[PDB]
């Protein structure tokens, strides 16, 4: 690079994201010239946190990984960012336990007068291929190809079809978005500034079973986003389908020699440090008219480990008091333990 490292130091005054709160002159100077084997840089990692000083509805991380090696090469920034975002989980000293045994959720039925729908998602990355911030068009097509091939192996109620977004009409896309089945077009500046809207919709698509109760998003926010959902509040069956579907998807992918990005410190590796560990967001849509307008609601959400979101997701506000309520933490606690903290965390919200 053409200047001293410090000449490139970003202006982060009035930036309220984890990256800006952890970046120091020392860390920046030490990492500016380091690169991953695929050539991903620190400036690319942090660009979204530099360009986006806030967000209208949620606290942001302000950095993304371009590849698996980003988390090693830029550990001096990612590690304190991970600790800050995940309430003390420290990948330098701790390890993460994966647990997808659905039987340990023995009771799971919400009051259907208040809770409209129930959903469990995670993400998975394929090792050897760059993540969405950095992937070339050929890497991204390869991800689609590896995913497509594996998912044709799914049987029974998990049988489904892949739909390329390039071959889907605007009318069919918008329908699926309005019915909470398909991702929005990446217009969010968090995503665009991280390089995650490049070449859209090339190699993006949705795979789903006929009932739309097991869905997989390909190459939007991650390589894959694996989703289980339905109308109502039966979290116990939703999670049994999630665990069964996910274990099979893994086996089908592993059958051809691909591995998921994973290590013992970070659990499953994904684009954004907010989705590390389990990557798991178990949630419901809930009509909480009285509980929402109360001034102490934000304190009850942060203490119960839950996040608030709009009816149309992270970038929207609530409509008709219908709030998206799900677990805030994703690493340090297992998938089982996180589902349990959503079953309990909603019932406090249904009573209160």
Ligand X SMILES: Nc1ncnc2c1ncn2[C@@H]1O[C@H](COP(=O)(O)OP(=O)(O)O)[C@@H](O)[C@H]1O
- Report how far residue 181's alpha carbon sits from residue 230's, in angstroms, rounded to the nearest whole number: 10
Applying CB under 6 A, does 313 fall inside the site for ligand X?
Answer: yes
- Report how far residue 63's alpha carbon sits from residue 245's, in angstroms, rounded to the nearest whole number: 30
CA neighbours closer than 13 Å in the CB half-sphere of residue 196 = 30
Beta bridge partners of 17: 60
* First-to-last C-alpha distance (Å) of the chain: 57
Question: Taking the complex as a whole, how short is the minimal distance between the CB of residue 241 and ligand X, in angstroms?
Answer: 14
Applying CB under 6 A, does 180 fall inside the site for ligand X?
Answer: yes
- Report how far residue 147's alpha carbon sits from residue 22's, in angstroms, rounded to the nearest whole number: 36
Applying CB under 6 A, does 117 fall inside the site for ligand X?
Answer: yes
User: How many residues make contact with ligand X (CB under 6 A)?
Assistant: 15
Beta bridge partners of 309: 324
Per the annotation, does 281 bind a ligand? yes
φ, ψ (nearest 5 deg) of residue 102 = -65, -30
Specify the residue, 73 or 282, whose C-beta has the smaller distance to ligand X: 282
> Which stretch, 115-123, 194-202, 205-213, 262-270, contacts ligand X (CB under 6 A)?
115-123
Q: How many CB atoms lie within 10 A of CB 273?
A: 29
**Ranges of H-type helices in 91-188:** 137-151, 170-178
Q: How many CB atoms lie within 10 A of CB 167?
A: 9
Specify the residue, 151 or 229, whose C-beta has the smaller distance to ligand X: 229
Q: Which residues of the chain come before a gap where C and the next N are over 2.5 Å apart?
A: none
- Report how far residue 55's alpha carbon sits from residue 57's, in angstroms, rounded to the nearest whole number: 6
> Which stretch, 34-42, 185-193, 257-265, 308-316, contacts ligand X (CB under 6 A)?
308-316
Residues numbered 317 to 346 that lie near ligand X (CB under 6 A) are: 324
Applying CB under 6 A, does 121 fall inside the site for ligand X?
Answer: yes
Applying CB under 6 A, does 309 fall inside the site for ligand X?
Answer: yes
Per the annotation, does 118 bind a ligand? yes
Per CB under 6 A, the list member of 12, 300, 301, 314 interacting with ligand X is 314
Residues numbered 272 to 301 that lie near ligand X (CB under 6 A) are: 281, 283-285
> Which stretch, 38-46, 99-107, 312-320, 334-342, contacts ligand X (CB under 6 A)?
312-320
Applying CB under 6 A, does 189 fall inside the site for ligand X?
Answer: no
> Which stretch, 84-92, 101-109, 146-154, 309-317, contacts ligand X (CB under 6 A)?
309-317
Applying CB under 6 A, does 132 fall inside the site for ligand X?
Answer: no
Per CB under 6 A, the list member of 234, 312, 337, 350 interacting with ligand X is 312
Per the annotation, does 310 bind a ligand? yes
Applying CB under 6 A, does 27 fall inside the site for ligand X?
Answer: no
Choose among 304, 149, 339: nearest CA to 228.
339
- Report how far residue 272's alpha carbon sits from residue 185's, in angstroms, rounded to the nearest whole number: 18
Applying CB under 6 A, does 119 fall inside the site for ligand X?
Answer: yes
φ, ψ (nearest 5 deg) of residue 147 = -60, -55
Q: Which residue lies nearest ligand X, judged by its C-beta?
A: 313
Residues numbered 222 to 251 that lie near ligand X (CB under 6 A) are: 229
Q: Which residues contact residue 239 at a Cβ distance below 8 angstroms, ignoring those fewer than 6 apart?
A: 102, 105, 108, 120, 228, 282, 339
Q: How many CB atoms lie within 10 A of CB 203?
A: 22
Per the annotation, does 225 bind a ligand? yes
Annotated binding site: 117-121, 180, 225, 281, 309-314, 324
Residues at the binding site for ATP are: 117-121, 180, 225, 281, 309-314, 324
What does the binding site for ligand X look like in residue numbers (CB under 6 A)? 117-119, 121, 180, 229, 281, 283-285, 309, 312-314, 324
């Amino acid at each position: 690079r053409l200047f001293p490292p410090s000449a490139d130091y970003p202006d982060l005054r009035k930036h309220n994201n984890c990256m800006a709160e952890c970046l120091t002159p020392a860390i920046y100077a030490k990492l500016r010239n380091k690169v991953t084997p695929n050539g991903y840089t620190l400036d690319q990692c942090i660009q979204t946190g530099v360009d986006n000083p806030g967000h209208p509805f949620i606290k942001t991380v302000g950095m993304v990984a371009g590849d698996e090696e980003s988390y090693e090469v830029f550990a001096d920034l990612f590690d304190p960012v991970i600790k800050l975002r995940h309430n003390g989980y420290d990948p330098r000293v701790m390890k993460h336990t994966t647990d997808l045994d659905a039987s340990k959720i023995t009771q799971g039925q919400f009051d259907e007068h208040y809770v409209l729908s129930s959903r469990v998602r995670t993400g998975r990355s394929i090792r050897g291929l760059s993540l969405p911030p950095a992937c070339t068009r050929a890497e991204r097509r390869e991800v689609e190809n590896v995913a497509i091939t594996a998912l044709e192996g799914l049987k029974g109620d998990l049988a489904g079809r892949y739909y390329k977004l390039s071959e889907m009409t605007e009318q069919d896309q918008q329908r699926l978005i309005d019915d909470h089945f398909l991702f929005d077009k990446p217009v969010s500046p968090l995503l665009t500034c991280a390089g995650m809207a490049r070449d859209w919709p090339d190699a993006r698509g949705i795979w789903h079973n006929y009932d739309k109760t097991f869905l997989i998003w390909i190459n939007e926010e991650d390589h894959t986003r694996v989703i289980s959902m339905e109308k109502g509040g039966n979290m116990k069956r939703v999670f049994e389908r999630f665990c069964r579907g996910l274990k099979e998807v893994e086996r089908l992918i592993q059958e051809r020699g691909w591995e998921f990005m994973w290590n013992e410190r970070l659990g499953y590796i994904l684009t954004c440090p907010s989705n590390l560990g389990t990557g798991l967001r178990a949630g419901v849509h809930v009509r909480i008219p009285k509980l929402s307008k109360d001034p102490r609601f934000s304190k009850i959400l942060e203490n119960l480990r839950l996040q608030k979101r709009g009816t149309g997701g992270v970038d929207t506000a609530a409509v008709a008091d219908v709030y998206d309520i799900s677990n805030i933490d994703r690493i340090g606690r297992s998938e089982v333990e996180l589902v349990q903290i959503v079953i309990d965390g909603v019932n406090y919200l249904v009573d209160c």
